[PDB]
Specification:
Layout: E1 2-3, E2 10-11, H1 14-25, E3 30-31, E4 38-39, H2 42-53, E5 58-59, E6 66-67, H3 70-81, E7 86-87, E8 94-95, H4 98-110
Antiparallel strand pairs: 1-2, 3-4, 5-6, 7-8
Bound molecules: zinc ion (ZN) (4 copies).
The structure holds a DNA duplex.
Subunit structure: Interacts with CBFA2T3. Interacts with ZBTB4. Interacts with RBBP6.
Subcellular location: Nucleus; Chromosome
Protein name: Zinc finger and BTB domain-containing protein 38
DNA sequence: GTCTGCGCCGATGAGTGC
DNA sequence: GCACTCATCGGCGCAGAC
C-alpha cells in the first residue's frame, strides 16, 4: 500500500517505507558512540557495536570456537552438520557455499 | 584461479506487541 | 492499523591451501 516514488518497491507501513527511503537519501541516523560510523538501521548499529565489546558470545556446540555474531556462528556450524543449502539447478549436487555452487552451475552452462 | 573459512555490512522479512 | 527488535541472506573482501 505504501509505494516508493523512486524505485516502485512497495511497503506495508509508513515505518518500513521511511526506512527504505534511506536507501535513496543516504541518511544514516544511528551513530556508533565508539568509532562514529553511522547506520541506516538501528539493528545494524547494535550488531556493529558488538565488534567493539570484544565479547565473542556465540560458541560452536561442536568445536567450541567463539564468534562475535550469531549469524557467523550459524554459517560456521554448517561445516559440522553437513548442511548444503545451495542446490545446483541442473543436477543432484548440493553445496555448502553459494560461490562454489555458482561456479559449478557456470560449468554446466559452458557445456 | 577455485575452494574454503570467516568478518562485517545493507536492506528486507518474521514475529511480537501496542 | 502501527512501530520495534532481531533474523535473514546475499554481497564483499581477504588470506591460506592447493
Ligand atoms: Zn525506493
Ligand atoms: Zn563503531
Ligand atoms: Zn565448530
Ligand atoms: Zn550441477
Amino acid at each position: 500500500p505504501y509505494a516508493c516514488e523512486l524505485c516502485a518497491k512497495q511497503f506495508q507501513s509508513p515505518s518500513t517505507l521511511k526506512m527504505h527511503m534511506r536507501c535513496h537519501t543516504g541518511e544514516k541516523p544511528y551513530q556508533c558512540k565508539t568509532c562514529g560510523r553511522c547506520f541506516s538501521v538501528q539493528g545494524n548499529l547494535q550488531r556493529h557495536e558488538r565488534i567493539h565489546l570484544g565479547l565473542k558470545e556465540f560458541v560452536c556446540q561442536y568445536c567450541n570456537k567463539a564468534f562475535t555474531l550469531n549469524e557467523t556462528l550459524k554459517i560456521h556450524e554448517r561445516i559440522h552438520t553437513g548442511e548444503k543449502r545451495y542446490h545446483c539447478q541442473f543436477c543432484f549436487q548440493r553445496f555448502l557455499y553459494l560461490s562454489t555452487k555458482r561456479n559449478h552451475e557456470q560449468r554446466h552452462i559452458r557445456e
